[PDB]
Design a protein around this ligand. Structure first.
Ligand SMILES: CCCCCCCCCCCCCC(=O)O
Ligand SMILES: CCCCCCCCCCCCCC(=O)O
Ligand SMILES: CCCCCCCCCCCCCC(=O)O
Ligand SMILES: CCCCCCCCCCCCCC(=O)O
Ligand SMILES: CCCCCCCCCCCCCC(=O)O
Lengths: 52, 242, 278, 242, 278, 52, 242, 242, 242, 52
């Protein structure tokens, strides 16, 4: 991308018929860390005491 | 034909190439993607999950017991509980954790780290603990008076069983080297010290266990990242697997 | 044209790391961010700004080198069959378990959906394994389960009317081809807590999920080889979905088709003589 | 010339390539396409056509007779007529049918299958038959009491000569493996059992033939498909044909 | 540009398999979907939903791997002429009947209209058939019926003023070329219930349709060969129309130009000892 | 096609003059299974009795 | 450089290639095109021009005389004048004509052909002639009764010297094979027979020449075409010309 | 990578290629173009400039004197002054002129040529001269009676010192061959004859020089051109220059 | 595949190529660019900075003293202080300066140069100096009378310690050659002479230092440029550095 | 140019950065033959006598 900073901007051009032929995907996809870090029924806000 | 000039790098195979390539089964139609819980898009979602430090790495301790730092009733004031060189590389206790094992695959790191400690003594067992982070330049702090001069939290044992010492990203540069490669002087990237001290003492009712434990846990903060993939040192083989 | 627009996907890596807000001192009984409870199973919520006095930091670091695509998106060795001169035929069973680096990288997840780019480097050598000159075509035939296997260099199975084949030269550029996600399942499985068969609980069929196994690559030279050929088979994983992260492999791998380990000395990190000094 | 970088896979010949290539007769003008009846665009149009199972595969039965399952007057109740492992691969009776011979060219299959049975006894010959499909996990059902617990139809011999047992796609996964490759444990894909039982008995007027036949027929339902072409096992040659 | 739009055809494989509608129990004398009559010659009309209680299933599976194009649309071996060093000349009669895999795939249909991509791999070897080095141009000449055939390596027929030729190197990339549907008929015929000639009923001209035969490929090296050359001729069938499906070949093929079979043991599937056990 | 599910979407680009040069066709064409499965003068609806 | 993948057929030379190629004299400016009479754009303009059949191919006839079929005063009724197998290939009389020599360069043909006959007897010489075309399936017609059952014209000698028998394209297929290649059974493409008969007789005044001639001529109709270029059989050389 | 098929002519070097090629100094910025008088864009600007014929090529004449054709007082009528075969090739007098030396670099020529003659006698010297151009087909004209039948000018010596005989492009074809290559019969391109005759006589006052000179000059007309570069015959070397 | 014709220069590696090439780490995200003082975009920003001439290059002078030209009290009139051949190449005093060391990397130069001189005598020390630039064609000026005929400045020692002699670009051509390559006669590019003379004398109070110094400094003007990179002569090695 | 007569019509496409990389120029440039054929202060029209 002739460079913004940490932004790689790519035009993936597949020359073949099957999508599997395309090169690797460069998108950043959504991160939901809280399904692993906060996997609890009741949210615990940072400023609260956790138990009770 | 269109006139061309193939240049240098013709016919090479680079393992990190990003090129399209002909599909050997161009008519295949894969099975649909179904919903599965826990989809991961980025390995820093794993690095932000707490894992247990193999913190009791004393010679002779084997198995599950390497995960519990001893904490005892002291007969002297201001004693030291624990000492740990802040390092994502090498082979010390951080190296076998989730964050440490991810760091084995990377060359460089940046960001804040947090250490969560859980006390395991009886309900009736009390104590106060000082957890210190010393930025680099010197040695491990020798006494609690010297360690307190750094970043530190003071932990009171109670109903809330656990504490966090956030080790903040304090650094001359935007990134550090994961490894401690000697020939390359990567000790340049020394990242400081973590020490644990008795702030008062562990106190027990008569005839209770005079020894309890801390389970140390570590994870990355949301400001953390890794660069440069590299081979994992301790995942080797001498033969093809059969 | 719009039709050519269909063959182009603009895709962007511009996700940043979290920044830092300045904070000041707090003297209160209201807000206690440092008090935690690891028993819940939740990771600590305390942040930098609530534990010390911070400055403001504008985020500048990317996260893309740890995206699952980037982490898997390079080629690794997965098969090294040797074609001898006695029969001029060899094969490789297709799975990523002979060589430990890719297998250990995959062990961070349970289910993985991907495509594959395969790359084959052929190298000719003498009996004493010194590089030598040999120009010859070779044939790699995909033989799926239930297709008859070639038994010789001249077997009429190499017709390849229905098995796909790639023909390339030993001293030419490397053969390369892509493969879609081929499992009968909706993902591959890195680990399997079950049996390969009903009405059977043989230990040799524990942990064997046959929907990971898509068959064989078979290799001949198109004439009888004068020198032995070594094929190196590289796989790059691409267009990758990953689910359910795991504790990664820590003990060395010992067998291709199960997780057996030594476990003689229960430790991973190195020892020291005292917990209060280095 | 335009600068280029030929990469890996240069000059290879892949048999499934989808590439244009120069025509050795670029001025040729073919004969027109005329109308012909029965144009086929997809081989699953053939797979949906019923064909006869080589169902009477008992050792010693040769020729056309392998196509008629015996059905007799029974002297005991609830007897078994037929048993068949549901398999598109291997070498059992389904393997030589239209659907089975197409499955020989493919590695994987999905969808519902139907089996149509035609009774061939005299007009005066009566009977009722139970046709059962047992999902996998165990063995072939041992008695009609066990077989009836599955999917099943009950057939009354009469003016409408034929019956359909639809074997529905009942499966943990979206696709199964066609083959039963042992080294690869493709028995993982075991697809269940088809059995036939006397629901009442075959009954005849005095002096009629005490034996008649069922002609079994099989075809794919419209929800059926195949993946991964593969070589047919039993279409071989030891020499070039002259 | 629109002119370049003429050279691009957007073509789509998105036909799905049939789905499933939920159904409930039926107790009636009105609707009897399970009662059939195979005597009519019609296949059963009964469906899943009318025989058992079904759930709803959204269709997700494609059908494209069994489209006639995909089924034939790969390369298969059809000719393997050997060029010896004594005369340095060979030929291959052009038809898809020497090698059984493509022939058996074609036996599913009566009439077939297609184009062909031919691919030729040349391999040099010694008298003991071990791969060897030989760099030489070779010439493949299409010789149609009635054109004089070359009799030697230096015959002036190889001028090729009107026969098309391809020149390629033995140790270069494979020669490849396409061919339109060339029959004088409006399709090719996989099977022919007639005679090649009027006023003749010789058994050797039964089943011979000469409109399938477009002639010969002739092969020389441009100099006299030092080692024998084996040409492997691959054909990929493309742009395919198919009519009138058949019972596919079941007995092994025995002869190139007729359907003769052994038929000693009349069975196809394997035997068992009892119809009521496996 | 950088992917919908089971939809392969291809731009066949022929570089040569003759249509026979083009790569293989990826269209799915119409299926009329009933010319082979229901090849009878009188339609028999599924819920009816076939004979009479 | 633009990443590329050279595929199979790289560096081959096909004699029917249609590719642009660098000009060794890119600044040359040719002489203008002037008007010349008789520009030909398509060789079927030549094939529609009549030429003389080498029809009197009897052993012993040499030179110009091979172009005149004898016609005599008959002493018997319904006699045969000529017989000719309808063939564009082979080596019979049609093979040396303009249409036949063009057919030597092609493998396949379609369309109607016409044969124009010119009588060369004296002004006073009379006669009527039957020209027959018999579609294939059998032999040459043996007598005028059998030949008349086919397509035929009846020619009266008179002021208009010439007649046309149009041999129409009557054919199971859209195209036939030019050659009669035996190993390939191209006799499959047998195209029928042309025969000439006395419809009445040739009659002369006393003492006139009792023998005259027909000059046969042949050409293609506008519905005619050729396919597949092929080498001409009889244009050979044993040495390079010096 | 984009699939490609390198064809014939790959990796060849043709000396007349018109292709772009990578610059070994891509950042260089040349000195500006300044005005210089006499810029030439096309070598036919040089060919239209008159130059002196090496016309007095008689054996024994050396140096500057080869540029002056003798003209004398005649003692007989209608005598010949000069004869010259019209040829841009070969080695006769036209070959060393500006037009002739350019023609050495080319294979073919077209257009009109002019010859300008300058008389160098004394002011008092008179004469009339016939300059003839004879189109090809025969020999050089033998006498002034035969030469006058062609294109010709008649020159009167006087104040205007010079005359032009325009040799017009008179030719069966649009172009002629420069060379007279014998093996290739390029004498086919014979372009005619130029001859000079005394129309009256050279006349002098008593005791004046009885011999004077013509300086012949030649150039191309604006309708002239050259094709096909070719190597110059007489610019050779036996060794590399040191 | 797209038909192509790779041409000459295929697979060559030119060190000045300007081509894109595949990145071995295509997912890497570098550290941000921070502000640093003194960013340089063009090495002619360095060439316009004054540096000290190694001007006192007399045999026997070592070290820092080579940077001070002696200036003394004279006992004779119009004496010479300094002489210097104007040359960016070679090995004389200009060659080791900032401008001279940049010129070592380049083949050609153009533009004006300035020389700034700083007097270092005591406050009480007076003098007047003539600084001359002589365009090429002859030798170094022999006396102050000859040198004054050129471009020159006259310097009065005083409060403003320094003077500039601007050596203007005076040149037949737009560029000169940096080097004095003998085999190639690059003395063609001789650029003239710089000389320094006593305009009056250096005068001192009694008992002061009778010798003082000039520090000469040189830099390029804004109209200056360099062409053609070339290897630096005096930056060599006989072995790989370890 | 797929052919007008003596008109070569070319699109010179340079793939490299420096103009010197481009192929050779195919333009016909202006011809002023008279700076060499008529290099004289006073024009002499064809129909006039040159001297005087
Ligand atoms: C042969 C057709 C040429 C089309 C290729 C144009 C160049 C590829 C696009 C690359 C897009 C991302 C590059 C970047 O900005 O970093
Ligand atoms: C040669 C063309 C078809 C070959 C299919 C290869 C697909 C390989 C996927 C392997 C996924 C399972 C990995 C494992 O079991 O460890
Ligand atoms: C070499 C260029 C012209 C060759 C023409 C080849 C066309 C082959 C079509 C064969 C179709 C009939 C197949 C068969 O008879 O079994
Ligand atoms: C040299 C001209 C470049 C034109 C080729 C552009 C890429 C080919 C189009 C491929 C279209 C189908 C790809 C896909 O979406 O799966
Ligand atoms: C790779 C980009 C393709 C662009 C090249 C298109 C063809 C070159 C243009 C040639 C123009 C002059 C040809 C002519 O008309 O004679």
């Amino acid at each position: 991308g002739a460079q913004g900073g940490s932004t790689i901007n790519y035009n993936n051009i597949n020359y073949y018929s099957h999508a599997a032929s395309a090169a690797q995907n460069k998108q950043d996809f959504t991160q939901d860390p809280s399904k692993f870090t906060q996997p609890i029924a009741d949210v615990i806000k940072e400023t609260a005491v956790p138990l009770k | 034909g269109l006139p061309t000039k193939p240049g240098p790098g013709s016919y090479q195979f680079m393992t990190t190439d990003e090129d399209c390539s002909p599909c050997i089964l161009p008519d295949f139609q894969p099975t649909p993607e179904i919903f599965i819980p826990g989809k991961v898009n980025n390995l820093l979602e794993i690095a932000q999950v707490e894992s247990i430090l193999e913190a009791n790495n004393r010679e002779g301790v084997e198995g599950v017991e390497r995960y519990v730092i001893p904490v005892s009733v002291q007969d002297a004031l201001d004693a030291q509980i624990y000492a740990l060189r802040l390092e994502l590389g090498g082979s010390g206790p951080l190296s076998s954790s989730l964050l440490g094992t991810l760091a084995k695959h990377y060359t460089q790191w940046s960001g804040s780290v947090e250490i969560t400690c859980m006390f395991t003594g009886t309900f009736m067992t009390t104590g106060k603990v000082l957890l210190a982070y010393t930025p680099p330049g010197g040695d491990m702090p020798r006494n609690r008076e010297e360690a307190m001069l750094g970043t530190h939290v003071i932990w009171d044992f109670g109903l809330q069983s656990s504490i966090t010492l956030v080790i903040p990203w304090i650094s001359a540069s935007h990134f550090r080297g994961v490894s401690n490669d000697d020939v390359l002087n990567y000790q340049y990237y020394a990242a400081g010290h973590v020490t644990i001290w008795y702030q008062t003492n562990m106190v027990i009712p008569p005839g209770f266990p005079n020894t309890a434990g801390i389970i140390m846990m570590i994870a990355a903060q949301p400001n953390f990242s890794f660069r440069i993939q590299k081979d994992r040192e301790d995942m080797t083989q001498t033969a093809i697997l059969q | 044209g719009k039709m050519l627009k269909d063959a182009i996907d603009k895709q962007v890596a511009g996700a940043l790391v979290a920044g830092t807000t300045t904070s000041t001192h707090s003297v209160a009984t209201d807000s206690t961010p440092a008090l935690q409870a690891a028993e819940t199973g939740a990771t600590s919520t305390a942040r930098d700004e609530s534990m010390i006095e911070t400055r403001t930091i504008v985020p500048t670091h990317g996260i893309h080198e740890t995206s699952v695509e980037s982490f898997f998106g390079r080629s690794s060795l997965v098969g090294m069959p040797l074609l001898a001169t006695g029969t001029s035929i060899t094969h490789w069973r297709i799975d990523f378990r002979e060589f430990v680096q890719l297998r250990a990288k995959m062990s961070w997840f349970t289910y993985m959906r991907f495509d594959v780019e395969f790359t084959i480097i052929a190298t000719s050598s003498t009996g004493q394994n010194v590089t030598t000159e040999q120009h010859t075509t070779y044939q790699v035939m995909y033989v799926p389960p239930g297709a008859p296997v070639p038994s010789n260099q001249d077997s009429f199975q190499w017709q390849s009317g229905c098995n796909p084949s790639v023909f390339a030269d030993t001293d030419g550029p490397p053969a390369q081809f892509s493969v879609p996600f081929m499992s009968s399942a909706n993902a591959y499985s890195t680990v399997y807590d079950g049996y390969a068969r009903f009405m059977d609980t043989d230990p040799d069929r524990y942990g064997i999920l046959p929907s990971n196994f898509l068959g064989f690559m078979y290799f001949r030279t198109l004439e009888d080889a004068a020198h032995q050929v070594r094929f190196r088979i590289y796989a790059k994983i691409k267009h990758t979905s990953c689910w359910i992260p795991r504790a990664p492999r820590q003990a060395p791998y010992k067998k291709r088709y199960n997780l057996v380990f030594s476990g003689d000395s229960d430790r991973i990190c190195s020892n020291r003589a005292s917990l209060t000094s280095y």
